[PDB]
Design a protein around this nucleic acid. Structure first.
Ligand SMILES: Nc1ncnc2c1ncn2[C@@H]1O[C@H](COP(=O)(O)OP(=O)(O)OP(=O)(O)O)[C@@H](O)[C@H]1O
Ligand SMILES: [Mg+2]
Lengths: 86, 201
DNA sequence: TTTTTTT
DNA sequence: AAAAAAAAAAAAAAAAAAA
């Protein structure tokens, strides 16, 4: 319902067939069984790359919080390289 | 346009539909003039669909199936006309398609006997009938397009190409162009073909 | 010995 | 008063052959 959003997000499961393309998505943030950072959606789940993340200050980024993630998918592994988060 | 990939196959079909000229010499007899192409590949890779498209696109074409045909009934038949009470030759399947194209499906699933007849019509493009007091040579200058399955369920890329095919080399060397199609499993191609198919439906 | 294929 | 039949297609049982 936000004014700015009329770009559109993409469900997680629709990220299998593309790579080297920027996207936008949101969902639960938690730790997978293995112990890595993952985002969960009713469609599915992916992994998170954090090594070069610049978050929006003023928020308590906590597991269990809805977050908006902008990044680049990479099919070589399964890492959604994040560059911004709010 | 509804078939994804296989660009070189489309080019081969285009070149085959309008093949080269015939050559006849007062001393050199005759030289074959058109092109023949064979398809062997793993199941469900859109060979029959392309063959059906070739059926619809070409001017004159006849459809045959390996299991649904008999070699003797494919070239000529000895039947008696009702009004005259005289037995006269009845034109066979591929004779009707002279100068046209004949498409065969399940080619390797045909009875071996019929195969020898094919070799004859691939040798000098002429079939001879000598039976029941009739001796006649019939002209048949048609081109053949066909598709066949490998001996196993799927093509084995590590084996001898002759090991994967059930047809003898005697008639396989006759065919000008042989194509091998295999559905390599790549997620990018999977997504692309999925988009195309969903666009079609 | 058994199943296959040809007559 | 008589066209009647060679050429095909399809269904078996026996024997022999290959694994
Ligand atoms: N590149 C393709 N573009 C569109 N459809 C395709 C493509 N590849 C396969 N298909 C689809 O795959 C299906 C396979 O159908 P079809 O029986 O004609 O294939 P085939 O490879 O000729 O198989 P077979 O050897 O069993 O006859 C079709 O429904 C066809 O639409
Ligand atoms: Mg097919």
């Amino acid at each position: 319902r936000n004014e700015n959003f009329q770009m559109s997000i993409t469900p997680i499961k629709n990220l299998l067939g593309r790579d080297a393309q920027n996207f936008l998505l949101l969902g639960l943030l938690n730790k997978n069984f293995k112990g890595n950072w993952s985002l969960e959606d009713p469609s599915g789940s992916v992994e998170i790359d954090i090594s070069q993340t610049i978050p929006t200050q003023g928020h308590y980024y906590v597991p269990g919080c809805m977050v908006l993630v902008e990044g680049i998918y990479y099919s070589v592994g399964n890492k959604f390289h994040v560059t911004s988060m709010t | 346009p509804s078939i994804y990939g296989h660009d070189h196959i489309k080019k081969a079909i285009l070149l085959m539909l309008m093949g080269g000229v015939e050559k006849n010499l007062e001393n050199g007899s005759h030289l074959r003039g058109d092109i023949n192409i064979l398809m062997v590949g793993d199941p469900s890779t859109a060979k029959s669909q392309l063959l059906r498209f070739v059926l619809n696109t070409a001017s004159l074409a006849i459809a045959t199936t390996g299991r649904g045909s008999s070699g003797v009934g494919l070239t000529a038949a000895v039947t008696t006309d009702r009004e005259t009470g005289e037995r006269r030759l009845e034109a066979g399947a591929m004779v009707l398609a002279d100068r046209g194209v004949v498409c065969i499906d399940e080619f390797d699933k045909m009875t071996d006997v019929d195969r020898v007849a094919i070799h004859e019509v691939m040798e000098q493009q002429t079939v001879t009938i000598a039976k029941a007091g009739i001796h006649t040579t019939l002209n048949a200058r048609c081109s053949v397009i066909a598709a066949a399955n490998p001996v196993f369920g799927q093509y084995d890329v590590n084996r001898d190409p002759h090991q994967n095919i059930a047809l003898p080399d005697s008639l396989l060397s006759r065919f000008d162009l042989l194509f091998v199609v295999t559905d390599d499993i790549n997620e990018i191609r999977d997504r692309s073909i999925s988009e195309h198919v969903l666009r079609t439906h």
